[PDB]
Symmetry: D2
Subunit: 360 residues, 4 copies
């Protein structure tokens, strides 16, 4: 019943200002923080060797696209390695990102680990020494961070334990981040795996988010200085029943309205395996949903922003321009989508229509 201010007014201002810049009108997040083991798969899909140089080159390709992406990208999430790499001109990637008006983010979790006594459920690790890491990342140009928790819909999942534990660790992560001037993006991803329908996903999403915000309250988290990265509400990837984009949007906005406090600065949806087009179309339908939405509704896409790019690159340096052009195209589309002004013109490409879903 007693207040022991976790943050000073100055600290709150800094956090709030950062969170708002990232999701400013028409802007979204480029999630390019895939680890080596994670990106290696994406590189093998185009027969490109997974080396430090190739990774550096590919990230440079994305980060140095022409100025058309500047008004589209409010922030860029990088993996530790990339945060300390430099472009061909010697400029550190964080400087490159900032010079284009983007905020630099860093992935800080150390992956998922199994929860004993559950049916294949997990929690996420990475709290050890997090305070010092955040302090160092802040000095090196980072202003926000990302931490991913993973839940799955099944007959007995997500369990009470899985929900409680993941919500609690997210809260710990957010607390430490805010003590170091780092805006935490809270990511409680509910996988699309399974044959459940739209209402089932909506039910689970509402229960999970309710648990997430109660935990953030218990841990004294400054919501205005945070961002939420949830899954859109959609039927399972194996569901038979079909739904329109308007139905996905309505189910998504309703779940959020029923659980996310207005104080939360913004919601940055993960693409979760959806195709580049689908992710853009759904984000657009969401922003056009005829319900009051007190928070920015935009993107934090990884796969949905890189599909066509990776394919256009093919590991060949000579395809630089071609690849970048594909990325710019998706950034412009999503920038319009997070404003509810996106209308596919029909020239997205076969790559932009292919499912980016990966079984878990």
């Amino acid at each position: 019943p007693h207040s022991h201010p976790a943050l000073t007014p100055e600290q709150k201002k800094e956090l709030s200002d950062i969170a708002h810049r990232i999701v400013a009108p028409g802007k979204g997040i480029l999630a390019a923080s895939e680890s080596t083991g994670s990106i290696a798969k994406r590189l093998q899909s185009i027969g490109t060797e997974n080396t430090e140089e190739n990774r550096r080159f590919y990230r440079q390709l994305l980060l140095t696209a022409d100025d058309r992406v500047n008004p589209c990208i409010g922030g860029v999430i990088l993996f530790h390695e990339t945060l300390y790499q430099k472009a061909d001109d010697g400029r550190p990637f964080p400087q490159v990102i900032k010079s284009k008006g983007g905020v630099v983010g860093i992935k800080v979790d150390k992956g998922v680990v199994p929860l004993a006594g559950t049916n294949g459920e997990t929690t996420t690790q990475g709290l050890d020494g997090l305070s010092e890491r955040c302090a160092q990342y802040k000095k090196d140009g980072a202003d926000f961070a990302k931490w991913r928790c993973v839940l799955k819909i099944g007959e007995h999942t997500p369990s009470a334990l899985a929900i409680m534990e993941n919500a609690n660790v997210l809260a710990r992560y957010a607390s430490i981040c805010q003590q170091n001037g780092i805006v935490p993006i809270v990511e409680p991803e509910i996988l699309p795996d399974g044959d459940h329908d739209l209402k089932r996903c909506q039910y689970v999403t509402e229960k999970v988010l309710a648990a997430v915000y109660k935990a953030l309250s218990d841990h004294h988290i400054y919501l205005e200085g945070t961002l939420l990265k949830p899954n859109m509400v959609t039927p399972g990837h194996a569901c038979t029943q079909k739904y329109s984009h308007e139905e996905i949007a309505m189910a998504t906005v309703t779940a959020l309205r029923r659980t996310v406090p207005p104080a939360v600065t913004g919601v940055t949806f993960l693409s979760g395996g959806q195709s580049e087009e689908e992710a853009s179309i759904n984000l657009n339908a969401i922003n056009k949903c005829p319900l009051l939405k007190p928070w920015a509704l935009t993107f934090s896409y990884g796969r949905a922003l890189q599909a066509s790019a990776l394919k256009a690159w093919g590991g060949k340096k000579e395809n630089l321009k071609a690849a970048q052009e594909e990325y710019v195209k998706r950034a412009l589309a999503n920038s319009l989508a997070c404003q509810g002004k996106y209308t596919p013109s029909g020239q997205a490409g076969a790559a932009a229509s292919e499912s980016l879903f990966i079984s878990n």
Copy 2:
């Protein structure tokens, strides 16, 4: 978890429709559901015998005020006794309220009870046979209900137990109401008693509301079909530090923005002892606060709508017009207040 639909689409529509009608633009709630014992002191302050007839006449006086209150009153909360009384012309009070465009509400809790092992804290009782009561009340004209829980700010209060128990009982009450087509007004009142400051009230209010909504989620409550009746965020009555109405508005709106889901149809503030003018001025400031508010911010006033009317009446049947006139003036004042149009004549710091 798995979904076992507590409500059908039709039931949800009914509840949401009722909730929206009560807090429609410019409208608020007249809370006239005082019990015999609760109205006792007030009648004593005007030397009027606490008889059912005087209580009937007084309620009639308020319910039959002229048509000017119609666009100001979206709902009227009644005590059990009054729901079954009639005006002199024979019209049942519920009919009088509805004829003026108001929704009829009913108080259903059975008062507070002491929580053993706490420093004078309480929870509220009244769940027994509540479903049958709500069904009967619905049949008799009521569309919404009220249940009051009370919390106190002190050295060791509100405690974890009190916060948890009161939030849980509020959720049970809300669940039962919705099963019977009754919109529940969730009232977790944090008393203004004490010398604590504005920051302290905001902190406690935030923690209480966070607990309330987690409980409503656990109990599967349909938020669009509910209303919230909280205390405004203010310093304690014995606090020596002074604050402006704008600061009160900022703390209140900030507290709500951090805990109340957008899905909640409306917030109807209790007056909690504030004077008629003070309650109106603060509600006005709250609606003028430069922050985004996804829900209606209006009133559910008991004392703040009746103070002057009660004094003007003085238990004198011949003062009818004078008394009603005072109530009408406050109804008009608050209707403008919930629109941020009433005039008597750094957010990071929160």
Copy 3:
């Protein structure tokens, strides 16, 4: 983290003394608090009209059995009606019970109610005005009470909500009882209904009891002044896999050892549909289980103590003695059973 004593040393002593007397070595509880509607089938099963006199006569039949039952019965739970009835000699039933060395108990809940949004799950009501009721029952001879919560094992049950809510209401009930010098018997019954196996029942029982005791702690319940009335751990009533009495005993004792604090004075098992012999044999096996048991492990049987008595009675006064004889036989069998002295004539796998 601050204490505000719910009970004084004197109040604790009274509660602890009562609880110990009820479960003293070799003693158990006769659960005869069936309501009019609950005893209806019992009476109609023997073609007996369900009148107040027949109910009075039947209760008298059990309560006035000979002194052989005295050392077997530490307590008798009665229904409101029976607490105020008298034997043929004019003696109030509470007096008849006490004169035989038994403590008088009273059922105080008001039945189960449906939890909206669940798959047919329930919580229990009865807290309204419970403090005053307890005060009166105490004056009228009762020293302990009973409150029954019901949980069910199914595909998605017991749910998180059902467990938390039932645990919480049991805590409220216990708190109110202790404030009035009444020892609360906490009964979180997990029904045997279903085809689930022994391990499933053990798992659910462990989770439910863990929730129950956390709630009791949160509500400042004095465990020494309470008793626990749980279901034994058994396979579902329709489970295809079969088990031995030793297995049931091991699962039951293991579940209790993992959740029930040593401070709890006693565990009084409900028979839950088991036959008279089955309930006695299982209770005996539980007491012979080769694990340390820090609490009395006895009975609180309703059906398992009355089955044969009811049939022998058949609603005829001339069968009084024959009927009482059957009751005595079961009282003697279970008294031996709660001591592990009854004869009908690898824990890591749990």
Copy 4:
């Protein structure tokens, strides 16, 4: 409401057998897992340079004490460094411990960290990569571990957040340990600092332990394969009111009886700053307390077993025997105490709580 066994019967048996050996009748735990920074202060109090060799020599001094300690020591908690050091004869310390009948333990937490928004409250870190660490430690001779959470009694502490978070992290630590065949010692230490009285400590201990066990239940922790290392219930250090050893024992045993499931194999009290003699007398009183105690009530003493030994050593090799004698004396005394047989000579109400 569905079970997905975290452990097999074989795994449970292994954890249960380990836990029981550690707290077998008359046995307790030598807590010698002080970190380099913690042991630094210990070495300075005797004017001895804090070097690895001096640390090894000191740990060897305690571990190679004569056979008299064998029936007294059921387990020895070591710090990472020590688990990999060897005695002069080349025998790994883990081997030295086992050969004397003791079970080897390892401290695995990574210290406390501040909980933002609280009044100087903390939680404990060390879960990252803990599973891999536990598997490695098991392979290298350790069978149990220790994780310390710290709570403080003050005006607004322990707070709801502090209690919930510390209980939750302890449960995660316990879960990871059991998955790797390691018996976790759950240590929710409530500091004795402050002017609070005996009943205040008892109240707080009761609330903390109830939260600890609810969390262990939620995380499906196998209680029979765990031990509890709590503070004894005593008045605050600055408390003006005085209490007898009998009252401290009654408050302690009452607090435990109201919260610790009988399935818990044993309770190993920390000395928490009490003198060697006080810790032994209080432990003996706890064991003589006229109430039913379904678990072993013994010790897991650090300072209460090393105070005199450290002083007698003084960092001088010639004081080896004198130093070992001081340790052996405390081991024998506490061995008798955890049996309620302690006497100054040697081997020879309740409703108000």
